[PDB]
Amino acid sequence: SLSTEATAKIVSEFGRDANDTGSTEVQVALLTAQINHLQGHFAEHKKDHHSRRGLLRMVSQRRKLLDYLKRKDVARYTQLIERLGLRR
Amino acid sequence: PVIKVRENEPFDVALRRFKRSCEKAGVLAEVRRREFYEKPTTERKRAKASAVKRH
Amino acid sequence: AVVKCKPTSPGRRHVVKVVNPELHKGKPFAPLLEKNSKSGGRNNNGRITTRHIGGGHKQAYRIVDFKRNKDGIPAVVERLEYDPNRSANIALVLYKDGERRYILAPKGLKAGDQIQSGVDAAIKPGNTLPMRNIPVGSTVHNVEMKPGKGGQLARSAGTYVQIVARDGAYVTLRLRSGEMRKVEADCRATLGEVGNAEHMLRVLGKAGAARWRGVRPTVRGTAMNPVDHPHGGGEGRNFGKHPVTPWGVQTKGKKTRSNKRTDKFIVRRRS
Amino acid sequence: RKQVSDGVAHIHASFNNTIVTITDRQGNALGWATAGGSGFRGSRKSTPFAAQVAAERCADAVKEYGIKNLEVMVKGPGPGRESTIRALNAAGFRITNITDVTPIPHXGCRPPKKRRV
Amino acid sequence: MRHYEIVFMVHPDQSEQVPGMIERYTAAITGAEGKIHRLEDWGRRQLAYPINKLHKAHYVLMNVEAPQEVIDELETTFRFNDAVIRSMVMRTKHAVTEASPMV
Amino acid sequence: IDYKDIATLKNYITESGKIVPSRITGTRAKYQRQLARAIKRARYLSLLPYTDRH
RNA sequence: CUUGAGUCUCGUAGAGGGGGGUAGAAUUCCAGGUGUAGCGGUGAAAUGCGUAGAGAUCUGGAGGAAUACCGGUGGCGAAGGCGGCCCCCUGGACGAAGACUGACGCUCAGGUGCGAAAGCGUGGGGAGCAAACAGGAUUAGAUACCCUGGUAGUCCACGCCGUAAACGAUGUCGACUUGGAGGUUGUGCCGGCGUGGCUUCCGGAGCUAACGCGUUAAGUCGACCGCCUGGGGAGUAC
RNA sequence: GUUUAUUAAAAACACAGCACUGUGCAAACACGAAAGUGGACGUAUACGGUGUGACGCCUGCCCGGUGCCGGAAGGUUAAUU
Ligand SMILES: [Mg+2]
Ligand SMILES: [Mg+2]
Ligand SMILES: [Mg+2]
Ligand SMILES: [Mg+2]
Ligand SMILES: [Mg+2]
Ligand SMILES: [Mg+2]
Ligand SMILES: [Mg+2]
Ligand SMILES: [Mg+2]
Ligand SMILES: [Mg+2]
Ligand SMILES: [Mg+2]
Ligand SMILES: [Mg+2]
Ligand SMILES: [Mg+2]
Ligand SMILES: [Mg+2]
Ligand SMILES: [Mg+2]
Ligand SMILES: [Mg+2]
Ligand SMILES: [Mg+2]
Ligand SMILES: [Mg+2]
Ligand SMILES: [Mg+2]
Ligand SMILES: [Mg+2]
Ligand SMILES: [Mg+2]
Ligand SMILES: [Mg+2]
Ligand SMILES: [Mg+2]
Ligand SMILES: [Mg+2]
Ligand SMILES: [Mg+2]
Ligand SMILES: [Mg+2]
Ligand SMILES: [Mg+2]
Ligand SMILES: [Mg+2]
Ligand SMILES: [Mg+2]
Ligand SMILES: [Mg+2]
Predict the structure, then answer these.
(1) Domains contained in chain C, number
(2) Cα C146 to the chain's mean position, in Å?
(3) Interface test with D, best of F19, F53, F54 (most D CBs within 10 A)
(4) How far apart are CA E33 and CA E2, in angstroms?
(5) For residue F5, what is the nearest residue in chain E, using CA coordinates?
(6) Structure-derived torsion over alpha carbons of residues B8, B9, B11, B14, reported in degrees to the nearest 10
(7) Is E97 a member of any domain?
């Protein structure tokens, strides 16, 4: 999956601690990076149905986490989505 | 199932050794297993039936 | 790329057309064209010999190399072009010394490949070799019947032959009709299959789309008079006769081959 | 005609018939005889006694070659596997090897459907 | 940047021109920032069963740590080089620097 | 287990060339699978005979 | 706030999914070499094949389909299902010590997606097997069971179909409730002592009309959903 | 779309589509006492003959007769001697 270097970079640059690996923003960043990466894999592999399920699970989990962040704090929510370049 | 014949080894001993080799390798049984076709459902059914009879 | 046209007109309702988006779009190479005039199915006496021929679009002849005689000089394919004189496409090549020629396009050949002819040529599509250096069992096209003459077998679009044996000084081929023939082992052949396999997936669609090819209408035998065809005549729709060609020869079932000087090379009939 | 002194006996015994041939080391055949090619026709055509008779007559048919050594190759699950070997040995011959070459697919091809009897 | 076992057997009659070329392979590896961990020449051996009417073959084993694309190009070279009759590239989990059972 | 230890792999092959069951030799479950993989790797690599007929 | 839920570090086994390449055995066909009168098939027979040289045997070539042994009341998968070997891409599960977010959770009508075999459309492919079909037998008859041949189909790429005794005839999530005999996969201490996950058989209280289930419940409970209301007519008609 | 110029323009001819069949190239076939020529400067996804007539569902039973293809155990049978 995601390389150790990429995850280390995103958590050491994007979270509010040296070892912050559990915040909502960090999770959303990891899921969006993995989704963007797997888009390329699924471009050439239409008939891969047993990984489409994992991709759908990641999408749903990202949606629920963003729902929670919107419900709790809206300002940092908008900050996160503008950093990540998303719509909702 | 190759069986040779040596000096001071009579006919019947070599014949019995060849028969034992054939029995061990199960050549005739394996041939008679591929006589016809078997539905995979029947394969799994007979396998489980034998396994539950053994228990 | 077989595409079906939308039925905006009665003549376009049934049309299916094969478009290749790789053919050269401009004009052909100038020093390799000639002139031909349509005959209409008429010989030097002016009489009609073959019926249902006449008219059509004008064409020019392209000098295609069927010998590949020059050897030891690699060549690079320049581009693929459309030839109206046949059913396959032709690919212009540029030899290392500066000479250009037309060859038949094998299957899978594109611009930027390399070809080669001779006795040391590599075994890959596009090359041509005598059938004694070619591995038995392979598939070839543009075969010769006589050593030195030129490519004369399996030359249409999509066709090919297969070498099945080598009985000393000869080879045995399985032709597209199923007939097995013996040819000299010194005849050359070209590796691969001739391209444009989508030729028979084309529907002409209308009556006038066959007159662009120069094909005049066919009149049925029973629709004639007793003085014109053996089948002609009747009050209504009457046949009562064994089917025959317009000249009396039986047309449905009868064999017509008669050639005793080449029957020695026919291993078996197509049947 | 020719002298070899060591051939190879090929036995092909199936559920209905047994065919016995003798060849050279290079594969070239010399003579043959079958259980059904000996008058045993129908149900008796497969019984091992027919195999023994076929082996004996086939051995007698190769009296002009003068062979003293043999190998045997056994094929098929037919009943003619032991009787043929004994007949070959007891025909005045001498076998120095025994080998089974029955073909066995390693999967291959779908067999005919089961006989509903 | 992964470890690999590379085994190949080559025609015995070409044995006299095997050594130098494997160096080139090593060179290629060392040209692509790859690491050689072990290289043993098993030599001429009798095959367990005849391969295309041959009986002997020259077996050579190489131990590499290299990126995947270099292994891909090496595999293509092995495919086209008619001298070698067979080859096999196995991806391992760690370095296997030791004495092989052959020697 | 590796395919390069042919001497030990000899002990787990029948006379014909097959693979002995686990219950006959009493070995474990995982080692049987790894052994079978090694045997197949060696059989492809022309180190072991596929069959016995010749 | 951290006990529910999830992220990070390490490692573990696996027919989990997709793409490409490749090794052996075997049936069929084709071309050569020896050899001559049978081969094949049934309970018994013949249609069928063979003197233009079959069948048997040896060397070689082509093509297609499936991977002997290992092999397991084994393993993976949400379900249908998944098996020779190697590389590339990729999903899930699990285990020891710890760090992190702090209820972010469960179920689900509409909706979206996957979905054995057969069947359809377009284009390739065709070794074996084999609906329809042809002939030989059996029989009072035999549109079959038996025998010899054989076209769709079975194979691949794409797009449809959306059905099965699609079954554990048992909806998903969580909590509590005597035991025994095993299989498989991780970890700690000195063959033993603990500890988790998945699974097979027997059986106690309890439950059921009974058969039986029984810590993987059909036992004691909470949440949400789906479905049932006599048999034909009928899963039919509009 | 074509047709009986000058009493018949139609349901008649043609047609895209389907099938049977012949043809291995000095191709089958046609015009020629012959040489030659068309087919074709094309090579079985090509050419000739025959019937039916877009598209949809489909196309059953009969090989005695008359044709065509294949077989040769027997009978009769020309020129020749
Ligand atoms: Mg015509
Ligand atoms: Mg026509
Ligand atoms: Mg017409
Ligand atoms: Mg008229
Ligand atoms: Mg006239
Ligand atoms: Mg007339
Ligand atoms: Mg009329
Ligand atoms: Mg009438
Ligand atoms: Mg009439
Ligand atoms: Mg032969
Ligand atoms: Mg806190
Ligand atoms: Mg749900
Ligand atoms: Mg619903
Ligand atoms: Mg289809
Ligand atoms: Mg089709
Ligand atoms: Mg149900
Ligand atoms: Mg019910
Ligand atoms: Mg499970
Ligand atoms: Mg109940
Ligand atoms: Mg119980
Ligand atoms: Mg309905
Ligand atoms: Mg009009
Ligand atoms: Mg007019
Ligand atoms: Mg008029
Ligand atoms: Mg008028
Ligand atoms: Mg008509
Ligand atoms: Mg009809
Ligand atoms: Mg008739
Ligand atoms: Mg008749």
Answers:
(1) 3
(2) 19
(3) F53
(4) 12
(5) E101
(6) -170
(7) no
